[PDB]
Amino acid sequence: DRRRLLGPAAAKPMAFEQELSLHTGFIENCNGSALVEARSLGHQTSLITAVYGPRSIRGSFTSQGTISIQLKNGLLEKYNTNELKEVSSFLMGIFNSVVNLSRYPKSGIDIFVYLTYDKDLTNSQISSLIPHCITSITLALADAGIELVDMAGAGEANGTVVSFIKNGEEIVGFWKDDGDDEDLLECLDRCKEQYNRYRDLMISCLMNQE
Amino acid sequence: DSQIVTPGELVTDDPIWMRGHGTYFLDNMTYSSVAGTVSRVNRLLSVIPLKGRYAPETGDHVVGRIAEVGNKRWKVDIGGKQHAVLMLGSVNLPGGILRRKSESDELQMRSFLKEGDLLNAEVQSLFQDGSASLHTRSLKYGKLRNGMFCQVPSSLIVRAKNHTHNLPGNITVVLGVNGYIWLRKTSQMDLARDTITRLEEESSWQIYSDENDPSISNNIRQAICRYANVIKALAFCEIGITQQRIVSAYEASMVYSNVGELIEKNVMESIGSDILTAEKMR
Amino acid sequence: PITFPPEVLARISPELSLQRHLSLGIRPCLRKYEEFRDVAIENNTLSRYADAGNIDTKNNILGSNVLKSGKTIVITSITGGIIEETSEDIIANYASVYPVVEVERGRVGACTDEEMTISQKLHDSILHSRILPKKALKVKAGVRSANEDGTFSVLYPDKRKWSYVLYAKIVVLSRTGPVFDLCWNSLMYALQSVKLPRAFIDRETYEIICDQTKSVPLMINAKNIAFASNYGIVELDPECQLQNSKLNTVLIADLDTEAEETSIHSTISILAAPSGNYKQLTLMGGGAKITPEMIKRSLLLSRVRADDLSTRFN
Amino acid sequence: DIEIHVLEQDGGIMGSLINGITLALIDAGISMFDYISGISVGLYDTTPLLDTNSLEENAMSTVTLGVVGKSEKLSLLLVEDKIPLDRLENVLAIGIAGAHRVRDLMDEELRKHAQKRVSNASA
Amino acid sequence: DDKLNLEESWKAIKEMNHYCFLKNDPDFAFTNFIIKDKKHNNELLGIFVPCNLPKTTRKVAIENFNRPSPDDIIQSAQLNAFNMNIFEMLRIDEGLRLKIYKDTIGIGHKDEAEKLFNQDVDAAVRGILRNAKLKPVYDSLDAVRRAALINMVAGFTNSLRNQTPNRAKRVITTFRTGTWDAYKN
Amino acid sequence: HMSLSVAEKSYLYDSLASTPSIRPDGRLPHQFRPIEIFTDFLPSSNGSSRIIASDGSECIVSIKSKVVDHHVENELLQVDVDIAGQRDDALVVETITSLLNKVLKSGSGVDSSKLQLTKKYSFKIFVDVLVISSHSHPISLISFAIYSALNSTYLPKLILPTFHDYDMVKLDINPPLVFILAVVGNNMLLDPAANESEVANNGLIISWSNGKITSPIRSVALNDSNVKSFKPHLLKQGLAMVEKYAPDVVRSLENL
Amino acid sequence: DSMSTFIFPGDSFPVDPTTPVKLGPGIYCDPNTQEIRPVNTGVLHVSAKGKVQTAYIDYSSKRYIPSVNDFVIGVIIGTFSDSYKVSLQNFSSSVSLSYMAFPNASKKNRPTLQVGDLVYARVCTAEKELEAEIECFDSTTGRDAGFGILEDGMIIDVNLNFARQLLFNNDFPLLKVLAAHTKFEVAIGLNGKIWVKCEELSNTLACYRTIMECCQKNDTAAFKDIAKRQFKEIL
Amino acid sequence: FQFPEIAYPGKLICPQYGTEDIIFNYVPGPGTKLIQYEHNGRTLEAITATLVGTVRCEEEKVKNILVSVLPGTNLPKEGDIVLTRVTRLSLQRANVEILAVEDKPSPIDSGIGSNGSGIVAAGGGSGAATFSVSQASSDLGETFRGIIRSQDVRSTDRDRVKVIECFKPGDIVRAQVLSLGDGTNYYLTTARNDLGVVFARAANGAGGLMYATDWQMMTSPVTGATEKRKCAKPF
Ligand code: NA
Ligand code: NA
């Protein structure tokens, strides 16, 4: 690498239900920002989002806003690039359903999600991580002053992530990747309860903070 | 029919001929630059390619899509080698001739035509590169509504006096010479191709409205689907598209009560051969 | 009476904003001339050896540091590797780390001039300040001998050579000004927390493998550990001075808030050791005349800042 | 824009690319002065071998030729491994000839495809 | 009748908008870590005003900016000239004198009562811009064809293709020559 | 196709959301468009397939194999996707790649035991996809091509492992199918056309194996213009629709 | 004054303070300090007087910067709606040449210049905020002023000092030693471009070679010799 | 009922209409949107806040009312006042870059220090050469670009406006957005008393700051010299 100090090439790498804290507007060089930390028994996570935008776009005139979402591995290179981009695409769909894009012609909104910390002491963790991503992105978008038709929420149960809006009446996101086979309804119910709690916490955070 | 020639082939050693497209020459020797048929029209010798993009000609009636909004002009996709241009002063503004040039309407060009809008237009003139300059000043030209778009190769569009036709089932077809085709609900303007009409003409105060007729019956929609499918069927059989062949395709397709059936290969071929046979027998 | 918020004033006329603030004895970052930003540190929280009782198996982080100054956050993580070696205070016998600085600003893509120069200067300054001797990176290979016949145990001394190679990933959130100092200090604390994993072995060659739990202290020369300071020299323009109802220059410490970064072109940066010696000095007279007095005050402030940063924790 | 996908490879792939381009460009109705025929010739000791496969391309030096139409003029001349100068010309001699044959083949297809699709389009 | 009553709608709004507020905020030493721990002059957040500058010259500047801008001068001039041109036109085609009227007060309704004329004229403008058909062409017409159109301003419309002997010649010619020339003589 | 005018979008949407839905070509909600498939045309590969759709979408799949130690390579099936006009860095390409890799994971995507040669060695399956042309989400297209390619895949026969020189054994496995659905209003559509996908409220990616609705299942925005939320009963509708109209796709693909 | 003196950027300006001095190239008036400071390395040049003396610094330069009343040789690189896009030097910012900027020119009667044509023009406008403008006519009367197309010649790249010396200094022997051998047409462009055309291609080539070789050599007296050896038509 | 005063995304403010007497028609302004929600198997048309802040329902000319949401207790739109920096000048137009929209800097990070130690443009460093167009909207310091045509400078005398006497490179100009324009440029105007140059430096950005003295003139305090601009009226 000509743009980085990677050191010697001869060298080889060394081989050998949950509480929530939500805060916004602590990053000064972007429009929106959100810190989300989650603590369940024998499992702790924490991630940060940053919304840069509405910014200018290269290319032809666009009739509406263009949202980009970038997942960044924090600390450990925990996940595959392909899976990260897949989740990114999923979230893009969700917030394409949520953000009021009509308000932002010829404009781009770039969202960055840093996965700083993800250590669960229990001895495919993407699924359990997605709802917190959605929480943080909704919080950061609301913090950036980016218009949202609703507060995008989500829940996870049995490898099934479901993202809701409108008091859980309708679905903006559905992610199911193995994680065993169970009937759909109770996963829906559990994820909806998680969604409602997360929603309450997010509005609360948006009323004590903004 | 005609002499089939390939690139680099000697067409004639005679220097008398003028030389059109598909040819190049060295002294008296004339060679072909494409694969196609030799064409002799008066003193003009040329070679017509078997395949090629739509080449716009002055006076052509085309359907196009707004690709770009620019400075005092629109860039429209016709399906040719280059984007056509549509000058601001080459369109009709909402109203009578009376309104003079404004800077304001130049600033709100997007209200008349925006990126994505389909329009019916005429090729006024050609630039040096061969790209088309367009105009929409006639009342029959403008933004297209109340229907569906489909397309065929431009070569399959046989030409006539008109390219906007009234078809049974109350559906008007707009056959662009570039192969771009619009299928719409027949309007009162469309109805008036016989031989309070003035109020009718003025009623289209909005020729840049993005709203459809609030009343489009399921019958008209089904018929739109059927016309689309049979036009695509004629295209698949490489049959030249004409009004009569379209209505004949429609009627012949009425055999299949479900319009979906028209998307299968053997059905398309059957409709095609039905039309050709019927044409040869008459 | 037309009015601009401090933010947009810093965008529109940085020089005017800076001068105007300085006319009141303050700065656009709301600190006075020689007032540093406070710093807060979470050390060795990301390392695998963070908890001696329950060592994280999946983790590969040898060292950790989380620094916060003003509103800027710097996260530094030290990973490692091993290279097979081939074949005094002089520079030849010293080593450095290989840092990758990632300053979080709006863009995505390859490294900016900022990131590249900060990385390289971190490397070079680690090398020249002589904080890390090559000898300390030497691996003492134990050997894995088989229990009787039936499994395996490893024996370490209380036959080729090998060397440790340290890598640093440094991410910077909420950048408001020059961030090299923060990166340096963060990397210093991080280096102090590094623990080197013990290593053992079994035209053909066998791989060396690190022990899962055992680790020895990365012995760095604490004498040579310096801390970073930066200063701006501003020339006061008589017309932009507020009424506050013949040329002057002022010294400014710990630059921030864009107005300062955009306006100030005369800068000093120091790596100073608590002992009294200096590890690095950079003078750039792009604007105002850099006088000896300014240099001396800068060295003084750098040394008190160094004592401060070295003492404030533990 | 020319978009090429090599699905299968067995040596002499450059000339193949050339031929594919010629065919596709002619099919597009895009005007050009003549055919360009691509061929490869290997040199085994004293004797040249026409249109080399993968096994022949290894353990042997090869020359790739891009010949314009029926002419002796070369659009492309590619030699990537060492060849005795005094034997190079000979290698070209057969190569050109081979390329000519290739032209005759491509031509032979086009005409047919023409003759077929100009007769059926009629009525 | 899928629609809901306004009262039912307000209800439904009250039930949808319901959420569970919670005053206090929820260990988490990292969040705490990231979230830890004058200027009454207002002369600093304004346009550059030189410290040197004397008060008199400041008064000069403020004075200069209190006087109308060149745009204002030309605009008001063009408006006044417009008013007297449209009165002079309407006068040439509709007589002027006071207090008696014979059907077929001065200008088609003290000659300071010209204000009333203006009052009338604006109404036409007020009346013209409102209806949506006309607004583009009036917006696009220059002062004199604009004047001819005001002159014309329900069933009078004839598709563009108290009284005067000759107005047709005068007004229509004015409408597509775009000059006051016919009126001048 | 793509970049329709607002008028066109309104017309198409109104037809597709009416009851019953009127599709631009008159298809039933569960009806597919005519496609044709060719196999066994790439001799160098262990398997091969080519699929052509009526709208022009064309895809090519190659099946190759190599011996690997399970212990060093836990993944015995790798899908590499190459879409023309799209860089390998592209978001959609890596998304499709990840998805396909998950549908075909040796874990439970397909039966890993069918690949085993020896307790230390096996065949790794390299599935190479080349999308020549696509006007809609090519996930079903690719899935079908891969199905055909795997159902006509032959591998060298075992006798360090040594193999028969001329005789080869047909790879026996039940490859999964991935279906794509368009959610338009209250209507579910199978095999969405480009114009249909331009106005669709949302989308459903639903995997399918041995006659069962299996994972992965995704909600996917077929565009960025009209992405709206949907009710759960629609999801149930989509699942039911797939498991109702999947065995006929399976019997159509598996009849040679 | 009359004595020209070598000078470096940053050196103290040595002219009379009480005497008014109009400042040419090389001399910079600092916008903040209002100090008169030299910014170019070369020879300081003070004209006698008149009404005020001109102080300028002649310095070696290869890159042309447009200034009004300069005679330049450009090449047409683009055609616009009401103007030509012209290049006075490769990699430099282009210059505008109005369609109206020609003799006997109206909106109906347009000039017949194509992309790739040589134009000999006068820099009429050289604002520091705007793109430079050239002209091919007398701006006052509107008739031909010896400007226009240059056909079938050969162009020669040359440093600015050489060109200025060629246009203004009549004691410069290059033109004279060239005239000694053949008849030729020459256009001198202060942008560092010299256009030459002879009746015979051989002679034009000879002119090209000898002009370039003369350009590379600092000594002036050598020219004649060079010309000789060059017009002896060696290969 | 009374409209709630605090607002968050997804919160419903009021139905489409209301009678209290006359029938107020509710128009979805900035921060709100008219969404048709579904409740009890039946339709409800409601104005929904899309932002966090205080809702406002103010009244402008059976009678409809503007419902919006203001943050506290962006993107250039038509009619918005933007503060710009003059980047280019030409006889026809003035190119500017939007630095702030309605007392809000855009972008939030200008990219200072990204390119090194000198004075470098937003994309004048190494980062600009390696920017991923595929994965991001724009580069670090990239700004919305705008154009002030010569016609759109003044309200009157629009035919013969000299932009060189109105703006200079580096000037900070207060403008209003006429049109969205194209992908590259917004179209702006200064044709109002409060619109125009709000900041300027003598010698085209090189000298010290000048202050506005008259509608068409600023002057430098240290030099006393006057320069011609189109000054936006302070206070
Ligand atoms: Na956009
Ligand atoms: Na050939």
DSSP notation for D102-123: HHHHHHHHHHHHHHHHHHSS--
Q: Which residues of D touch F84 (CB under 8 A)?
A: 3, 5
User: Is-contact F28 B260, C-beta < 8 A?
Assistant: yes
Are the beta carbons of H155 and E71 separated by less than 8 Å?
Answer: yes
Q: Which CATH architecture has domain A1-210?
A: 2-Layer Sandwich (3.30)
Which chains lie within 8 Å of chain C at 3 or more CB pairs, if any?
Answer: A, E, H
Amino acid found at D82: K
User: Is-contact A147 A100, C-beta < 8 A?
Assistant: yes
Structure tokens at H198: 């709000």
Residue B136 CA to residue B120 CA, distance in Å, equals 7
| Number of domains chain B is built from | 2
Which DSSP symbol is given to C266? E
B221 in contact with F, Cβ within 8 Å:
yes
Residue A92 CA to residue H5 CA, distance in Å, equals 32
Q: What are all long-range contacts of D103-108, with beta carbons under 8 Å and residues at least 24 apart?
A: D103/D35, D103/D37, D103/D67, D103/D69, D103/D70, D106/D19, D106/D22, D106/D23, D106/D35, D106/D37, D107/B6, D107/D35
Would you say the CATH fold of H74-234 matches that of H4-73?
Answer: yes
Indicate the residue of H109, H127, H199 with minimum beta-carbon distance to C13: H199
Q: Whose CA is closest to A173, among A102, A97, A84? A: A97
| Distance of alpha carbon E178 from the chain centroid | 23
Taken in order of first residue, the domains within chain C and their CATH numbers are 1-314 (3.30.230.70)
Task: Enumerate residues 6+ apart whose C-beta is below 8 A from D4.
Answer: D17, D20, D21
> Which fold would CATH assign to domain G153-235?
Ribosomal Protein S8; Chain: A, domain 1 (3.30.1370)
Are the beta carbons of F24 and B260 separated by less than 8 Å?
Answer: no
Which residues lie across from H199 on neighbouring strands? H172
User: Is-contact H106 H100, C-beta < 8 A?
Assistant: yes
Residue D114 CA to residue D98 CA, distance in Å, equals 24
Are the beta carbons of D33 and B34 separated by less than 8 Å?
Answer: no
User: Is-contact C172 C74, C-beta < 8 A?
Assistant: yes
Residue D35 CA to residue D32 CA, distance in Å, equals 8
| Number of domains chain F is built from | 1
Statement to judge: residues B75 and B155 lie in one domain: yes
- CB count in 10 Å sphere of residue F41: 12
Residue A44 CA to residue A39 CA, distance in Å, equals 5
Which DSSP symbol is given to G220? S
Structure tokens at C274: 């608590």
- Give the CB-side neighbour count of residue B150, counting CA atoms within 13 A: 23
- Give the CB-side neighbour count of residue G231, counting CA atoms within 13 A: 18
Task: Enumerate residues 6+ apart whose C-beta is below 8 A from C42.
Answer: C65, C66, E29, E30, E33
Residue E184: φ, ψ to 5°:
-55, -40
Q: Whose CA is closest to H176, among H163, H162, H194, H164? A: H194
Place of tokens 């549908």: F103
Q: Which domain holds residue F212?
A: 1-256
Task: Enumerate residues 6+ apart whose C-beta is below 8 A from G8.
Answer: G38, G41
Are the beta carbons of F87 and H135 separated by less than 8 Å?
Answer: no
Residue A90 CA to residue F218 CA, distance in Å, equals 8
Give the Å distance between the CA of A116 and the centre of ligand 2: 62
A29 in contact with B, Cβ within 8 Å:
no
Residue B228 CA to residue B151 CA, distance in Å, equals 9
Residue F245 CA to residue F206 CA, distance in Å, equals 12
Residue D65: φ, ψ to 5°:
-120, 130
Residue F114 CA to residue F124 CA, distance in Å, equals 11
What does each C-alpha distance from B210 to B118, F126, H106 come to in angstroms?
Answer: 10, 50, 33
Residue F199 CA to residue F8 CA, distance in Å, equals 9
For chain G, positions 26-55, list CB contacts with chain H under 8 A.
Answer: 31-32, 34
Domain of F153, CATH number, reads: 3.30.230.70
Residue C17 CA to residue A126 CA, distance in Å, equals 47
Residue C182 CA to residue C114 CA, distance in Å, equals 14
D33 in contact with B, Cβ within 8 Å:
yes
Task: Report the residue count for chain C.
Answer: 314
Structure tokens at G112: 């017949």
Residue D28 CA to residue A184 CA, distance in Å, equals 53
Q: Where chain D is broken, by preceding residue (C–N > 2.5 Å)?
A: none
Task: Enumerate residues 6+ apart whose C-beta is below 8 A from E50.
Answer: C239, H209, H211, H221
**Chain A, nearest residue to H105 by Cα:** A31
Are the beta carbons of D7 and F132 separated by less than 8 Å?
Answer: no
Amino acid found at B280: K
Residue B222 CA to residue B217 CA, distance in Å, equals 9
Smallest CA–CA distance, residue C215 to chain H, in Å, is 39
Task: Report the residue count for chain D.
Answer: 123
Task: Enumerate residues 6+ apart whose C-beta is below 8 A from E125.
Answer: E150, E153
Q: Which class for D78: exposed (0-12), middle (13-18), buried (19 or more C-beta within 10 A)?
A: middle
**Domain H4-73 indexed as CATH 3.10.20.80:** no
Q: Which residues of E touch B111 (CB under 8 A)?
A: none
Q: Which residues of E touch H100 (CB under 8 A)?
A: none
Residue F6 CA to residue B112 CA, distance in Å, equals 13
Strands, E assignment, A19-106: 19-24, 32-40, 43-55, 65-73
User: Is-contact H137 A69, C-beta < 8 A?
Assistant: no
Are the beta carbons of A5 and C58 separated by less than 8 Å?
Answer: no
Q: Whose CA is closest to B32, among B41, B43, B20, B17? A: B20
H136 in contact with C, Cβ within 8 Å:
yes
Residue E13 CA to residue E8 CA, distance in Å, equals 9
Q: Whose CA is closest to A110, among A10, A183, A29, A12? A: A29
Structure tokens at B176: 């662009």
User: Is-contact G97 G110, C-beta < 8 A?
Assistant: no
User: Is-contact C187 C225, C-beta < 8 A?
Assistant: no
Statement to judge: residues B41 and B90 lie in one domain: no
User: Is-contact C165 C81, C-beta < 8 A?
Assistant: yes
**Chain F, nearest residue to D9 by Cα:** F44
Residue B123 CA to residue B132 CA, distance in Å, equals 6
Which DSSP symbol is given to F57? -
Domain of E151, CATH number, reads: 1.10.530.40
Are the beta carbons of G127 and H164 separated by less than 8 Å?
Answer: yes
3-state secondary structure of F107: coil
For chain C, positions 4-23, list CB contacts with chain H under 8 A.
Answer: 4-5, 7-8, 10-13, 16
Residue F140: φ, ψ to 5°:
-70, -40
Task: Enumerate residues 6+ apart whose C-beta is below 8 A from G108.
Answer: none
Q: Is E103 a catalytic residue?
A: yes
Indicate the residue of D3, D7, D8 with minimum beta-carbon distance to F84: D3
User: Is-contact E29 H197, C-beta < 8 A?
Assistant: no
Angle between helices D13-27 and D88-119 (to 10 degrees): 30
Give the Å distance between the CA of D79 and the centre of ligand 2: 19
Residue G23: φ, ψ to 5°:
-100, 130
Backbone Cα Rg of chain A = 18
Smallest CA–CA distance, residue E118 to chain C, in Å, is 36
User: Is-contact A132 A81, C-beta < 8 A?
Assistant: no
User: Is-contact H182 H191, C-beta < 8 A?
Assistant: no
Residue B157 CA to residue A79 CA, distance in Å, equals 55
Instruction: Give the helix/strand (H/E) hosting F190.
Output: strand F187-190
Structure tokens at C229: 């300071």
Indicate the residue of H43, H155, H222 with minimum beta-carbon distance to E3: H43
Q: Which domain holds residue E125?
A: 70-183
Residue E71 CA to residue G141 CA, distance in Å, equals 35
Instruction: Give the helix/strand (H/E) hosting C9.
Output: helix C6-12
Alpha helix (H) residue ranges in chain B: 104-107, 109-112, 188-191, 197-203, 218-236, 243-253, 265-281
Q: Is the sign of the CA dihedral D42, D44, D48, D51 positive or negative? A: negative
Task: Enumerate residues 6+ apart whose C-beta is below 8 A from H104.
Answer: C7, C8, H74
Q: Where chain E is broken, by preceding residue (C–N > 2.5 Å)?
A: 26, 37, 104, 109, 153, 161
Residue H203 CA to residue H213 CA, distance in Å, equals 17
Amino acid found at B142: G
Give the Å distance between the CA of D71 and the centre of ligand 2: 7
Amino acid found at D66: G
Statement to judge: residues B173 and B148 lie in one domain: yes
- CB count in 10 Å sphere of residue G77: 14
3-state secondary structure of H96: strand
3-state secondary structure of E171: helix
Residue F46 CA to residue A159 CA, distance in Å, equals 35
Q: Where chain A is broken, by preceding residue (C–N > 2.5 Å)?
A: 16, 123
Contact pairs from chain D to chain F, CB under 8 Å: 10
**Domain H74-234 indexed as CATH 2.60.120.10:** no
Residue F59 CA to residue F83 CA, distance in Å, equals 9
Structure tokens at A200: 């309450």
User: Is-contact H109 H140, C-beta < 8 A?
Assistant: yes
Q: Where chain C is broken, by preceding residue (C–N > 2.5 Å)?
A: 87, 158, 202, 245
3-state secondary structure of B109: helix
User: Is-contact G58 G51, C-beta < 8 A?
Assistant: no
Place of tokens 């010799």: G225
Residue C225 CA to residue E32 CA, distance in Å, equals 29
User: Is-contact H27 H65, C-beta < 8 A?
Assistant: yes
Q: Is E94 a catalytic residue?
A: yes
Q: Which class for G16: exposed (0-12), middle (13-18), buried (19 or more C-beta within 10 A)?
A: exposed
Asked if omega into G25 is within 30° of 0 (cis), the reply is: no
Residue C157 CA to residue C198 CA, distance in Å, equals 11
| Distance of alpha carbon H207 from the chain centroid | 28
Q: Which domain holds residue B150?
A: 57-282
- CB count in 10 Å sphere of residue D25: 17
What does each C-alpha distance from B134 to B59, B66, B73, B95, F181 come to in angstroms?
Answer: 9, 12, 10, 20, 40
Instruction: Give the helix/strand (H/E) hosting E150.
Output: helix E143-152
Q: Which CATH architecture has domain G62-152?
A: Beta Barrel (2.40)
Backbone Cα Rg of chain E = 32
Amino acid found at F20: P
Are the beta carbons of C1 and H109 separated by less than 8 Å?
Answer: no
3-state secondary structure of A163: strand
Indicate the residue of D29, D33, D115 with minimum beta-carbon distance to B49: D29
**Domain G1-61 indexed as CATH 2.40.50.100:** yes
User: Is-contact C191 C218, C-beta < 8 A?
Assistant: yes
Place of tokens 């010896």: G146
Q: Please report which ligand is nearest the Cα atom of A103.
A: 1
CA angle C176, C178, C184 (to 5 degrees): 120
Q: Which one of E103, E112, E139, E142 is the catalytic residue?
A: E103
Which DSSP symbol is given to H172? E
User: Is-contact F242 F179, C-beta < 8 A?
Assistant: yes
Place of tokens 């948006």: A206
Q: Which residues of A touch H74 (CB under 8 A)?
A: 54, 145
- CB count in 10 Å sphere of residue A45: 20
Q: Is E159 annotated as a binding residue?
A: yes
Q: What are all long-range contacts of B55-60, with beta carbons under 8 Å and residues at least 24 apart?
A: B55/B80, B55/B81, B55/B130, B56/B80, B56/B84, B56/B123, B56/B126, B56/B130, B56/B131, B56/B132, B56/B178, B57/B123, B57/B126, B58/B123, B58/B124, B58/B125, B58/B126, B59/B122, B59/B123, B60/B122, B60/B123, B60/B132, B60/B177, B60/B178
| Distance of alpha carbon C275 from the chain centroid | 19
Residue B199 CA to residue D65 CA, distance in Å, equals 73
Residue E58 CA to residue E67 CA, distance in Å, equals 14
Largest CA distance in chain C: 91
The β-bridge relationship of strands A107-120 and A65-73 is parallel
Residue E86: φ, ψ to 5°:
-75, -35
User: Is-contact B73 B88, C-beta < 8 A?
Assistant: yes
Residue G193 CA to residue G212 CA, distance in Å, equals 11
Residue C169 CA to residue C100 CA, distance in Å, equals 5
Indicate the residue of B65, B116, B147 with minimum beta-carbon distance to F11: B147
Instruction: Give the helix/strand (H/E) hosting F149.
Output: helix F139-150
Residue F197 CA to residue F226 CA, distance in Å, equals 10
Which DSSP symbol is given to G93? P
**Chain H, nearest residue to E53 by Cα:** H221
Q: What are all long-range contacts of G24-32, with beta carbons under 8 Å and residues at least 24 apart?
A: G24/G54, G24/G55, G24/G56, G24/G57, G25/G56, G25/G57, G25/G59, G26/G56, G26/G57, G26/G58, G26/G59, G27/G55, G27/G56, G27/G57, G31/H202, G31/H203, G31/H206, G31/H207, G31/H208, G32/H206, G32/H207, G32/H208, G32/H222
Query: Which strands form H42-49's sheet, in the order they lie side by side?
Result: H11-15, H42-49, H32-39
User: Is-contact H140 C46, C-beta < 8 A?
Assistant: no
Which DSSP symbol is given to E3? B
Alpha helix (H) residue ranges in chain G: 160-168, 174-179, 201-216, 223-231
Amino acid found at D51: D
Residue E118 CA to residue H226 CA, distance in Å, equals 43
Amino acid found at F7: A
Instruction: Give the helix/strand (H/E) hosting E78.
Output: helix E70-93
Are the beta carbons of C239 and E30 separated by less than 8 Å?
Answer: no
Are the beta carbons of E159 and B96 separated by less than 8 Å?
Answer: yes
Angle between helices A184-208 and F232-244 (to 10 degrees): 150
Residue E94 CA to residue E88 CA, distance in Å, equals 10
